[PDB]
Amino acid sequence: ELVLALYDYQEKSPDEVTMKKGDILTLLNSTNKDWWKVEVNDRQGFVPAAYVKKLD
Numbered sequence: 273e274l275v276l277a278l279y280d281y282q283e284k285s286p287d288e289v290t291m292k293k294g295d296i297l298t299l300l301n302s303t304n305k306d307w308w309k310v311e312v313n314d315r316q317g318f319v320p321a322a323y324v325k326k327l328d
Contacts, residue, residue, distance in 0.1 A: 274296055274298060274299065274327045274328045275298075275308070275310060275326050275328075276294070276325045277292060277293050277319070277323060278293065278324060278325055279293055281319050285318075287317055288319065289311075289312050289317030289318065291312045295312060297310035297319075297324060298310060299324075299326065299328075300316060305321065306322075308320075308324060310324065
């Protein structure tokens with residue numbers, strides 16, 4: 273399942289990942305209402321669910 277970064281997000285903790293607006297990410301875990309685990313290129317970690325949008 274693919275998602276679109278709606279906004280830039282810079283990582284602020286060791287479970288997080290940095291993404292840039294318009295980036296296309298792989299949705300890994302949408303279990304948490306607030307933080308979704310995504311893959312941005314080679315790196316995986318959590319971003320705000322609200323800053324990404326399911327395409328798929």
